[PDB]
Write an enzyme that holds these catalytic residues in place. Sequence first.
Site, short mmCIF file in Angstrom:
data_model
loop_
_atom_site.label_atom_id
_atom_site.label_comp_id
_atom_site.label_asym_id
_atom_site.label_seq_id
_atom_site.Cartn_x
_atom_site.Cartn_y
_atom_site.Cartn_z
N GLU A 1 0.83 -1.20 0.00
CA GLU A 1 0.00 0.00 0.00
C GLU A 1 0.87 1.26 0.00
O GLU A 1 2.09 1.20 0.21
CB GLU A 1 -0.93 0.03 1.23
CG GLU A 1 -2.34 -0.46 0.97
CD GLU A 1 -3.19 0.58 0.30
OE1 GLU A 1 -4.43 0.44 0.29
OE2 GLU A 1 -2.62 1.56 -0.22
N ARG B 1 -7.84 3.47 13.19
CA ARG B 1 -6.48 3.65 12.68
C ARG B 1 -6.51 4.64 11.54
O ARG B 1 -7.54 4.82 10.88
CB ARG B 1 -5.90 2.33 12.17
CG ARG B 1 -6.72 1.74 11.05
CD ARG B 1 -6.03 0.53 10.42
NE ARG B 1 -4.75 0.91 9.83
CZ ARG B 1 -3.89 0.04 9.32
NH1 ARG B 1 -4.18 -1.26 9.30
NH2 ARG B 1 -2.73 0.47 8.83
N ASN C 1 -5.53 5.43 7.68
CA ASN C 1 -5.36 4.66 6.45
C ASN C 1 -4.70 5.56 5.41
O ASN C 1 -3.64 6.10 5.68
CB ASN C 1 -6.67 4.03 6.01
CG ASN C 1 -6.45 2.92 4.99
OD1 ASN C 1 -5.39 2.27 4.99
ND2 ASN C 1 -7.44 2.67 4.14
N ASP D 1 -11.38 -2.90 12.49
CA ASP D 1 -12.21 -4.03 12.09
C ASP D 1 -13.29 -3.61 11.10
O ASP D 1 -14.42 -4.10 11.13
CB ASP D 1 -12.83 -4.70 13.31
CG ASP D 1 -13.70 -3.76 14.14
OD1 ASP D 1 -13.42 -2.54 14.16
OD2 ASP D 1 -14.65 -4.26 14.78
N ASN E 1 -9.69 6.06 1.82
CA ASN E 1 -8.72 5.59 0.84
C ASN E 1 -8.24 6.68 -0.11
O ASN E 1 -7.93 7.78 0.36
CB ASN E 1 -9.30 4.38 0.10
CG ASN E 1 -8.59 3.13 0.50
OD1 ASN E 1 -7.38 3.15 0.64
ND2 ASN E 1 -9.32 2.04 0.72
N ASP F 1 -9.86 1.69 -4.32
CA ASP F 1 -8.92 1.70 -3.20
C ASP F 1 -8.04 2.94 -3.37
O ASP F 1 -8.54 4.06 -3.16
CB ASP F 1 -8.13 0.38 -3.17
CG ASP F 1 -7.41 0.11 -1.82
OD1 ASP F 1 -7.07 1.07 -1.10
OD2 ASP F 1 -7.16 -1.08 -1.49
MG LIG Z 1 -5.87 1.79 0.48
#
Ligand SMILES: [Mg+2]
Length: 307
Positions: free
Chosen positions: A17, A107, A109, A127, A159, A211
């Site tokens: 990532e 968290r 990202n 989660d 994302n 994503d």
């Molecule tokens: Mg991502």
Amino acid sequence: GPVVEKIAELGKYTVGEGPHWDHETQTLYFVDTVEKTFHKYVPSQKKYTFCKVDKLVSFIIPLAGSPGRFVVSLEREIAILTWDGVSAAPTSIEAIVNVEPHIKNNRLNDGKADPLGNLWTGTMAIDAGLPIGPVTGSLYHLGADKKVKMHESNIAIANGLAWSNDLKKMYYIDSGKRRVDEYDYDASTLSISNQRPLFTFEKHEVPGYPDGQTIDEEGNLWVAVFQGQRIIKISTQQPEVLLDTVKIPDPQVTSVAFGGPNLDELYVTSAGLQLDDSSFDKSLVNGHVYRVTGLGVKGFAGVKVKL
Ligand SMILES: [Mg+2]
Ligand SMILES: [Hg+2]
Ligand SMILES: [Hg+2]
């Protein structure tokens, strides 16, 4: 058609990532968002290194004006890591701010600097789940005096991010919405408004989930399709226009960044993590890094974070 090359030298990643191309040193940095590791690849010298920490990580971006220092995520903290690019651990860690001190199971990202050097990044539940799971994330930017500002809430999986060349638009992906949104971006106030869908997966029979994303010099968006085995090229001039599709062997494509000496080679990360509700058998899910050439477009060098 475009050439898609598996980068053998790089091996397989659980969830590779956050690719970032540093153009002056011709170096690709990236992360594994599950294995708590940072990664460096120098393609011209076939050099690979990694760095281990004990918190979840999701982005790595060089710090403007400070060679050997990077802005990173460590769980919910934005931090500066001092790293020589080769030792298996950081030299030191300087915390900047915890974006969500009292949300214990969130968290950070995806994160990226806008063209002005301001870090934007979003959060999510550790989660989180697709198509349905806990929706607890928000979108932030890191502003003056090391304080964050919030721009959007109700984000399931924070994302990919991108900005138009004229600095009038921002593009953003919450993977749970299965679409790319566009916003009016005010570069002087660093505020976004007039949220509307740009590209909706169900309208074009695109499988999977958006994503990471990046934008090219022509203004086209390149979007990684997780559980789609592809990257897609979409218009920013007209809503709901699919321009092209490039198949990637790995089904779980995670992100994209332009690189190479002429910024015309597209690096593509993917995830080898085998999930229980996958549309692809386990034999197909590996987590390689790929390089795509022959797309006929150029991108931009990765932008460093200004603090
Ligand atoms: Mg991502
Ligand atoms: Hg590091
Ligand atoms: Hg690092």
